[model samples]
Target chain A: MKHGIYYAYWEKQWQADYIPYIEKAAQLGFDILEIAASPLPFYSEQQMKDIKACAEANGITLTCGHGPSPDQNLASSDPAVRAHAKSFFTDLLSRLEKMDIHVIGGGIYSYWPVDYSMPIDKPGDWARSVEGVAEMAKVAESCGVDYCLEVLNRFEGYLLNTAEEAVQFVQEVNHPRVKIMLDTFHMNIEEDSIGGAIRRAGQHLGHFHTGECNRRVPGRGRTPWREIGEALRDIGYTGAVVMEPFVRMGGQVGSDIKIWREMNPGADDAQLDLDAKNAVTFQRYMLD
Target chain B: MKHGIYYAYWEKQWQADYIPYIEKAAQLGFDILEIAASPLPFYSEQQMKDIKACAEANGITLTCGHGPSPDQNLASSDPAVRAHAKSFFTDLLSRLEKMDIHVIGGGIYSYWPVDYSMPIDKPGDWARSVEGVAEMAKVAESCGVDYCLEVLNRFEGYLLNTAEEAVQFVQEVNHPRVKIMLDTFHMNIEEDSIGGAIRRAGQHLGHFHTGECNRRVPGRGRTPWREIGEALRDIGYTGAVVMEPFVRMGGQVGSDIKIWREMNPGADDAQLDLDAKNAVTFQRYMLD
Candidate 1:
């Protein structure tokens, strides 16, 4: 399994330059760098190509932590909205292929930090999302990319909160290009046993996100890393394990992630980098 | 340990008839009944006397799940607001004493469903809350009640998110009445290990809240009840273990608890009671 870190770990914003991050990932001895999937549309074709070449030059594999924009929700009840979502997803996949990114994951079937004020229609939304994901699988298969469906905590999402739920969803989608993604932070809250969830995912587990219970860098807080490592090995899984920790408070990242307080306060960029570097070493020792 | 369940578990609104719930809790095999703390002021003295007698008739012990109104925030920057909070707390304690309720717990140090749109001042708030809780201890001591300072999850509160933080806060308050309360739901989200946090809280743990990872009754979800039971034993915690599950969605209970979906859908009150009854048995077997 390749060890990685999400680019947003050091940034206050979601959209940023990718080339410098690729170099930084390499310098920090990371084998992968997961970028935010929403910013691909804003990047020019030349910039996308530059990012692709930079990752290749640095021997780093590119991945993404993705969430559809509200209007682009695949599970929307409106057919017109669903069609637009498919088009958006197809366009995003084309760009991901161009950038040599094979794995994109998160609430791709829905939106992030769900608007709780709105009434939820899980039955209707589930049917629409299943159909939408099956269509996405065709495009994803053709592009040689895998679209991973991440199981989120109940607070952030309602659709898929457990591995059993994700497993059922994937079975209905029924495509090799679509697989399950689990995050330790969410699993810590939703799963009865993190190891049990991983073992249940088994061959269908496409990707993984690693973090502490409080969304801090791995090893900085109380996540059962040793047990998680044993679980990964028990499943005989080899996938990209990306560190996704959102610290600091401000901008879109803070507002959307609901980071109300400045965690690890007064830490400069140098300190952030130092933590991430150490996290990579810790992840390798515990998960690789 | 006495097994209890919150009244809001079966109600849509926060304000309701406590007499029926007292009888229902006794019928459901719970030793304690936790009522919403906000409605105490609305109850007339006669009504309070009636509810107290009703609990006595049903052989039920009354407790409260509490959160002060926004205007009554003890950590507010305004001194007048802080003063009102103290007065409000004092009045509530007096009523609790009259009602034969000896325990009240929750985000009493701060408000619930925290207004994240407003800025947070952790250092300032923490210091003020410590001083405020110390003051609360004086009134609580006079009332012959235990004021439990519940450590909430980061989403619901920021003042105390972990047992270590609660321990430190309690130490500063330096009062026997100002004890720590830990909920399984919040601990699952923030603590490295639920058992470890319980062990850490040890002697300071005055009250306990029990629920599944998804806020369902004890046996319905993936909380490690065995490990939790072992921890409680290790800590020698012989306090009330209340089942606090919000399954329905619609009113103040739904809005405040963020119950977006109808969990255990189609279950009527009879079904809820059955679940609670079975849950009491589960709690006894697992926790007691």
Candidate 2:
């Protein structure tokens, strides 16, 4: 498995045109950089070209990471809703069409930070999402990109929160281009066996966010990394191990993400940079 | 017509528990306070009561404003997407099931920030949203609340951009409970005449965001609040004219909304507060 890091690790979330971090990550020995789709920033064509050039210079491939807001979601039964989501993915695919990045993944099945206070009929939503994804599959196949549906924790989102559920959804979508994305952070909370979930998601697993249980740098908690590595090796999976963290740097961002306190006590940006630099070092010894 | 303001005036976006803001808004003399539905934050029963008590204590009414993410859009053709959004509104109805706040409006027809780069079959999405909103109309009517579909400008979203279109959409929903919300900020961009659109929306216009043309406090811009007030009078309508602004306040919060550049230069917390205070003072003479 190749190593990568989400830009969120080094930069604030959704701050696009991440040239500095792109260079640092490449220097830091990461193979891929995943940019998010939220914020939906309006980048000029030249800006897009600038990001491309920076990534090219850094020798880092890019991946699109996003969970569309509640609005333009796929996996919806409404053709228009699905089409709106499809159009968004279509644009995303078009942007990645020529770029080095191709594979895209997130909680495509639903929006993030789900309002669970409202009860949802899962089977019904799932069936609609299947149809919705089927519509997207054709576009994805044509674009030569795959859509990896992520399984988030229940608190983060509602649909596809577990490996088994993601696999089932992908199977139902039944498209050559549609696949699964397993996030260890979410799996730690929802899965009965995180490694077993990884095993079941073997071939369908298109992207992976090898995040930690507390959303820290991986290998810093009770996560079963050795078993996870074994599961990946057994499955012969080849993908990214992106670390997604919501570090408490303290800002409008920190407040919005509600990063009130640091999980890694006394940690600061310097420590964060050290952890990121060490993540590659740690993974090379363990997973590699 | 009564003057109102969205909590966004003093509150942070995507924040669920709004008691603190509610208490302040009531004290600020905002007749109505509109709360957003996206990011669907959870609130305990006690918190709900706190907000209700605050509003009641301060003599301020509540209005729910939301544009479900693409995945949960109520007006989506995809049944699943529509259902997801429908369920959110279902819970919204349950919340308003017995409370002072019920009238909810936003870009319910589709997701926010519609990436127009990809071509969309607008008629298709519009029809789907109509059916989806119809499903919500039942709950709204039963719960004694109304659904106001906010028509946003093209840059912000797709589906309904003009007052004529919003009126047409509400007609399609054809429910007494489902009505139109016209935001002046959006109307400034898409409408032939801001006041004219207000007049046209007339009877079906359930709510009004009555914001400045440039997303400032009312009376700060060239938005003809006087003429718009006359139009509301012409309609013989009485509703909440909520003010919504995305000011360039420095913070992690400002970063999330991407208020990078100053819309109102030299504007900071004090200026933002003045804008908030000014909204109440300005609207009292014009809209109230």
Candidate 3:
């Protein structure tokens, strides 16, 4: 029931300067930090070590890490691409193990721009994804890390969209290191009930990505935090519930996606902050 | 299929001065305009009519309208709260119909903060939602407009979170105007396979909110647009796909709860522009 925030929020302002932000987050009472692997390559070994040191010093834990870019897809149609993706995860696992990171997740299946239109009958596509997971699992286990497989909605990743599919995929991989990470954001659009999905995932659940129903900070949006909390409790999931809100500024299409605009187009800055505060507070209230 | 951009982006910058922005979006080759109802009260009926006229002048159509905040839960446990929500939609439908708006949609259940954690077994809670939808459908039918239901991810809406659930709800409501709207951003997180969900929804699909898989402009992030296009074709979903990227300056959370930092923490203005260009290019590619 500890409160955590994704490290992605500081990517722009703290790209090269992460220690200060991590320390600040810890000071803000955030107990866990979900780190994305995107900026990993930018850090020198010493700098990376310092970042980890900062988290440790603040008593902050690095809960999970995201997969590499689509180009690093282990399930690529081409052999060279597949090799590159596998190598990427292998390297990721090796690095994270040194840092004692736990969950390795994201669209760890095929790369984005994934041929969703590609016939599932296409043996190569699904096979590459499955084989990649198995290989990644072996690496994760060897590195003493748990690999959490995420089923992205149809737009980002090609397959593995539902909790049922995610669970089934994990079963197919069939390894201790390979488990399921249920993101409330995805579940909102894809699953009927977040609570139901949590109940269904049960023991197979390893980690979580949480936010308001609208992807706002938290309490400010529509999510049923109490039910979510009750369900998590009911399922006996004690893993990290990471707060991962999208970056507000610094990118074109800053945050207004068509779906978002349709759902919550006029959401204001004050509302976002309110949501963030509410998410933290609500989680605390529920967990307690 | 047609393309559109959300009015919220420009609306924030210009506020009541959005008519110019609407004209600009029309000039940019957009064929549809998606308006948020939250801002409806901000402008007078004449102003709205002018905005609609501007769209017509630009050859763009007003495809849909979004609704009330989560705080305006139509399915509240309190009868007074439920009545308030019903009245809100009742008025909304009448106005939009008079304006000749075609589609009206949102997470038209209980608004957020109304105890999303209610026990599913508490048949009373679900009954309230069903009753709300039935009331809304009657209003929509009377107004001669279609009422679209959006199944959001966990953080935004309470009851309907998935396409299957959306379809089921629509079937239960059994209204002609009741249909489904899909946003790729939510779909990315919610559905294990976006294509599969689209196929499952089939002819029930009504509207679409488009953006990159990560809510960035298309082509910049990892959304699978090509496959989505093919899937739409496969499902025979002839709907409007609107480009709705969030425009954040700094310190603002984007629409989805997963902070953008994980995707690219250190993105600068140049990077943001590139992301926008990529989104535009992706849209063009999808249309092509």
Candidate 4:
């Protein structure tokens, strides 16, 4: 498995120049750098070229993740909203093609930090998400990208929280580009057994996100990484293992992530860099 | 430590005649029976006498848990609401004394199923909650009841989510009857180490709630119960250890708990009773 780290680990905001993170990730002994794809539409031609060039120069493969905004949610109740989402993803996939990024995962079929104030219609929304994802698969195929549907925790999302649910959704989509992405942080909450869930996702697992139970670096908490590694090996999952740790408490990132308290208080940038550096080693040691 | 189970484990609604649960708890080998104290104001004089009589005859010590309604929240921003909450708890404490119940815990400072739609004012509410709890401690002291402030998860309640936070709040109150209650399920989400949190709570841990990471029975998930047991021993805690399992889906219990998926699809009442019985043995083996 190729070890990677999300760029948001060092940033308080989602939209930013990610060229520097490409160098930072490589310096931290990571083989891949995962960036947010939500700001793809806003990036200039020069910005996209610079980001792609930086990753290539650092010898780091770039993958991306996204939490679709409410207006762009494929599972929205309105048909016009679904049409708008289709257009949005179609444009985003073209941008991924330019960056040569293949894997784009997260709550792409739904919105992020789900608005629990609204009543949740699981069956209706599930069917809508499936319908939208099937169409997006055609665009993903054309762009040579793997459109991965990330299984989120119930607190963050409602549809497809478990590996069982994701597998069924993938089968329903019936497209090669449409696959499953599992995150250790979320699996801890929803899955009865993380290893068992990994085995169940087996062939459908296209992308993987690793983090501690408390959203810290992988080895810093009691997550049974060695057991998780054994499960990955059993499944023969040779894919990107990205560390998605959100520790600090400020800015849009912290608010969206609901990080109420400071996990890494008094840590400077150098210390944050060291923490990320250690995580790459931990992931390689445990998941190899 | 005494082994206990909540009465709501069998019922869907919060308001129910808990007289029979005492007998069922004793039959299932539990030393203590925990029932909802929210309906104390509604319980008839005859009902309270019957519940106490049933528990006494069964040799089961009766404990209680509650999720205060919004109108009765001690941390309310409005003074009138806070006054109402004080009156409500004062009356409830009197009823608890009548039943010879010395323990009453769970979200007493705040309300349950938190209305996240309302903006959270942590600092202001924390001060209000502390002020309210100090007064409640006076009544609890007079009634010989331990008023435990439960450390809920971020999704459930915001004021106190960690052992460190709960310890600080208990210290601020500084009353003998005011105590801390820790749930293994919430600790799994917030605490860096469950055992460490248990040790930190130390003497302040007046009540304990145990269940799996997924709200299943104690032995069904990866909770490190033996380590938790060791921590309880380290602290020399002699309080009640209650297995608060909420399996199966349907009813107000399922809705309030956010148990969307059916955990035990075909589990009848016999299977439910068997599961609770097995949990008792598991708790005894791990905790004792």
Docking class of 3: incorrect
Worst 10 residues of 3 chain A by lDDT: A252-261
Off by over 4 Å in 2: A39-41, A76-80, A266-268, B1-288
Off by over 4 Å in 1: A77-87, A131-135, A171-175, A199-203, A219-236, A247-288, B77-88, B127-138, B171-176, B193-196, B219-236, B247-255, B258-278, B281-288
Q: Candidate 3's error at A228, in angstroms? A: 1.4
lDDT of each: 0.88, 0.71, 0.66, 0.89
Estimate, for each residue in B1-288, the C-alpha lDDT of model 1 and write its tens digit: 999999899888876778889989988888999999888977789888988999999999999988777888888889999999999999999999999899989888887767766677778998999899899999999998998999988777878988988998899999999999999899977776789999999999999999987788899877889999999999999999999987887777776786656678699989988999998899999987
In lDDT terms, which candidate is top? Answer: 4
Candidates in descending TM-score order: 4, 1, 3, 2
Cα lDDT tens digits, model 2, B165-275, are 888788877889999888876675445566778889989989888665436577765567788778888888887778887655444334333332345667676677667
DockQ head-to-head 1 vs 4, winner: 4
Candidate 1 residue A234 C-alpha distance from true site, Å = 6.0
Model 3 chain B: worst 10 consecutive residues (lDDT sum): B252-261
Model 2 sits at a Cα RMSD from the real structure of 21.1
lDDT preference between candidates 1 and 2, better one: 1
Q: After superposition, how far is residue B229 of candidate 3 from its true place, in Å?
A: 33
* DockQ-best of 2 and 3: 3
Scoring each candidate complex against the real one, what DockQ results? 0.41, 0.01, 0.04, 0.54
lDDT of 3 by residue, B86-179 (tens): 8778877766765567776666665531222333322465577777887788888898877777767644554666687778777877777778
